[PDB]
Design an enzyme around this catalytic site. Structure first.
Site, PDB file in Angstrom:
ATOM      1  N   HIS A  36       0.820  -1.222   0.000  1.00 39.77           N
ATOM      2  CA  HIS A  36       0.000   0.000   0.000  1.00 39.77           C
ATOM      3  C   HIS A  36       0.860   1.282   0.000  1.00 39.77           C
ATOM      4  O   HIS A  36       0.297   2.355  -0.166  1.00 39.77           O
ATOM      5  CB  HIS A  36      -1.109   0.022   1.081  1.00 39.77           C
ATOM      6  N   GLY A  86       1.829   5.641   9.746  1.00 41.80           N
ATOM      7  CA  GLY A  86       3.270   5.679   9.540  1.00 41.80           C
ATOM      8  C   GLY A  86       3.960   4.439  10.098  1.00 41.80           C
ATOM      9  O   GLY A  86       5.086   4.139   9.701  1.00 41.80           O
ATOM     10  N   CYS A 141       3.128   1.346   9.437  1.00 41.07           N
ATOM     11  CA  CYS A 141       3.073   0.222   8.501  1.00 41.07           C
ATOM     12  C   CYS A 141       4.449  -0.192   8.055  1.00 41.07           C
ATOM     13  O   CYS A 141       5.331   0.658   7.935  1.00 41.07           O
ATOM     14  CB  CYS A 141       2.164   0.530   7.323  1.00 41.07           C
TER      15      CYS A 141
HETATM   16  C1  LIG Z   1      -3.951   4.726  10.452  1.00 37.01           C
HETATM   17  C2  LIG Z   1      -3.207   3.471  10.832  1.00 37.01           C
HETATM   18  C3  LIG Z   1      -3.004   3.170  12.173  1.00 37.01           C
HETATM   19  C4  LIG Z   1      -2.378   1.990  12.517  1.00 37.01           C
HETATM   20  N1  LIG Z   1      -1.956   1.096  11.618  1.00 37.01           N
HETATM   21  C5  LIG Z   1      -2.139   1.397  10.328  1.00 37.01           C
HETATM   22  C6  LIG Z   1      -2.741   2.557   9.873  1.00 37.01           C
HETATM   23  C7  LIG Z   1      -2.837   2.857   8.392  1.00 37.01           C
HETATM   24  C8  LIG Z   1      -3.667   1.892   7.564  1.00 37.01           C
HETATM   25  O1  LIG Z   1      -4.530   1.183   8.076  1.00 37.01           O
HETATM   26  N2  LIG Z   1      -3.387   1.914   6.234  1.00 37.01           N
HETATM   27  C9  LIG Z   1      -3.924   1.160   5.150  1.00 37.01           C
HETATM   28  C10 LIG Z   1      -4.304  -0.164   5.346  1.00 37.01           C
HETATM   29  C11 LIG Z   1      -4.770  -0.909   4.280  1.00 37.01           C
HETATM   30  C12 LIG Z   1      -4.851  -0.350   3.018  1.00 37.01           C
HETATM   31  C13 LIG Z   1      -4.473   0.972   2.796  1.00 37.01           C
HETATM   32  C14 LIG Z   1      -4.009   1.754   3.868  1.00 37.01           C
HETATM   33  C15 LIG Z   1      -3.609   3.194   3.664  1.00 37.01           C
HETATM   34  N3  LIG Z   1      -4.023   3.729   2.363  1.00 37.01           N
HETATM   35  C16 LIG Z   1      -3.730   2.783   1.266  1.00 37.01           C
HETATM   36  C17 LIG Z   1      -4.567   1.534   1.398  1.00 37.01           C
END
Ligand SMILES: Cc1ccncc1CC(=O)Nc1cccc2c1CNCC2
Ligand SMILES: Cc1ccncc1CC(=O)Nc1cccc2c1CNCC2
Lengths: 304, 304
Positions: free
Chosen positions: A41, A143, A145
């Protein structure tokens, strides 16, 4: 004596963390040998998030679009490929800090340490379990990830998790290092059902053995039970059914303490049916399920 | 989202751990620059433990009696001195992995990470608080002495603790890096009273703010209190009296959440008087006091 939710020393993993930027998105990568692994992603923008066509998004990217920085130095990207939900960026320099490592797919109920990172920099380390429903209850912000989960056996780091997503429920989802999600999850910004979770029975019993070893014994009783009777109680309280394989894995702790596994099951049965009555076990007022029988033996024997 | 008992990444500290052997005793040392720091009880045998005359025991030792090994390589000891309860072994080689560091004496109620070690090898990392009575509730076995506690601010490790002893009660005691014990403890095998401990009120309030930030809000109520009224409740429940300095330190969390500190005090007051009623906060069934307001902000903002 004493019993803590201990993580593995994170040093060998800190030496592998890098920052990966693609377009305007920045996240963490894991640099092992001449490959950097990161969530696919990283190639998405905000409009892509809902239903990304990763194949098409990746086609618009070239090696020079993936900015990889290991601390202050820039890595030169000479190849890129997507494997399931991870991107593998081939770089021209092998990581000099690459520890001995393996990629493993852990089982639900197993535990691992997470090195939470932001911008390729480590922020903290914590121990957690892969829930029976394949989610993890982590501590991750935007951030984070690309932060990874791992276990260490002497000098070998077994990487088992890469962080990808926070579900709308605030629980976390991710993949093995081949980019296969744990659980039914997809890397899409959508509501996704995480299955019914259960308590990891074998881990709670392991932790009750840790409590006895460390002096907390008030919960020991005059009773015993059978696997069938205990499993009727485990069913009512949303605990995983105990099997003979679980009893066998608890063998070393049963031998060390002299408390038969089914007698410890009868203690757990009474705690489930009556609660703690305002008492604590190893500093907890609930039944802890994030220590495996292996964790208990390792911590109680000082394995380095 | 999510909130975990997070430790600092231990890598910078792992690079400083060495094994120190004197006679038949082996423990851990901390190698910074050209000095190795370790508990002075490394010079004791089993008969010495009860009432050691450390000055006399050290006089029978020479530089060549202190065997210092950093992993597989042996360090050459060119000097030795005792400073309070620590020995400082001057070696002929500066540690190439010496991070930027400071020695600090932490205050009771402050938190730090411990890198538990055996035979100079790191086994695990965990976060804990220095109790108001100057003990720590760690996880330490025989051979863990010399393991250290620390905090990290970007690239600087502030070492605050070196492990020395397990009291008969199973709680832990140790020193700052100048060898001064925290608390009234002496490095003698004797029963030693640890003062009456209390719960770190400012930390519990910080953790209640962390709970609100992460979605656990059931404990918020329609009430408020005063510092005087809250302190009458804190007295009854063995909590540290809250001061305006504590309220001021909670300012950033009060501003982020919009919940006035005295309103959070009224929530804590109701939880103290009524308990949790079988509910949980951030996965805990008790009021957690091992996160400072600084820890909560750091974890909630992703500081690396
Ligand atoms: C906000 C946060 C807090 C803790 N752990 C992860 C996140 C970010 C998140 O879930 N991003 C994500 C997960 C699957 C797919 C996609 C994304 C981002 N955009 C692209 C497609
Ligand atoms: C058994 C253990 C478990 C966890 N942490 C520490 C220990 C060992 C311990 O307390 N040693 C000690 C502490 C003060 C003084 C002395 C000694 C040893 N003999 C020399 C005089």
């Amino acid at each position: 004596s004493g019993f803590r939710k201990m993580a593995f020393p994170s040093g060998k993993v800190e030496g592998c963390m890098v920052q990966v930027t693609c377009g305007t998105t920045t996240l963490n990568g894991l640099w092992l040998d001449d490959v950097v692994y990161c969530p696919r992603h990283v190639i998405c923008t905000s409009e892509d998030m809902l239903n990304p066509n990763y194949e098409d998004l990746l086609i618009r990217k070239s090696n020079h679009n993936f900015l990889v920085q290991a601390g202050n130095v820039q890595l030169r990207v000479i190849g890129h490929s997507m494997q399931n939900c991870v991107l593998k960026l081939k770089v021209d320099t092998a990581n000099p800090k690459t520890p001995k490592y393996k990629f493993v797919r852990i089982q639900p109920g197993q535990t691992f340490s997470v090195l939470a990172c932001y911008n390729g920099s480590p922020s903290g380390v914590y121990q957690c379990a892969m829930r029976p429903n394949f989610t993890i209850k982590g501590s991750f912000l935007n951030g984070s990830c690309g932060s990874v989960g791992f276990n260490i056996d002497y000098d070998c780091v077994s990487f088992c998790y890469m962080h990808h997503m926070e579900l709308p429920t605030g629980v976390h989802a991710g993949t093995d290092l081949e980019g296969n999600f744990y659980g039914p999850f997809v890397d899409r910004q959508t509501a996704q059902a995480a299955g019914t979770d259960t308590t990891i029975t074998v881990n709670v019993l392991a932790w009750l053995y840790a409590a006895v070893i460390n002096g907390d014994r008030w919960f020991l009783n005059r009773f015993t039970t059978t696997l069938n009777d205990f499993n009727l109680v485990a069913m009512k309280y949303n605990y995983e059914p105990l099997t003979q394989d679980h009893v066998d894995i608890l063998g070393p702790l049963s031998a060390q303490t002299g408390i038969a596994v089914l007698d410890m099951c009868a203690s757990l049965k009474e705690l489930l049916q009556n609660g703690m009555n305002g008492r604590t076990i190893l500093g907890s007022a609930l039944l802890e399920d994030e220590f495996t029988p292996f964790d208990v033996v390792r911590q109680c024997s000082g394995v380095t």
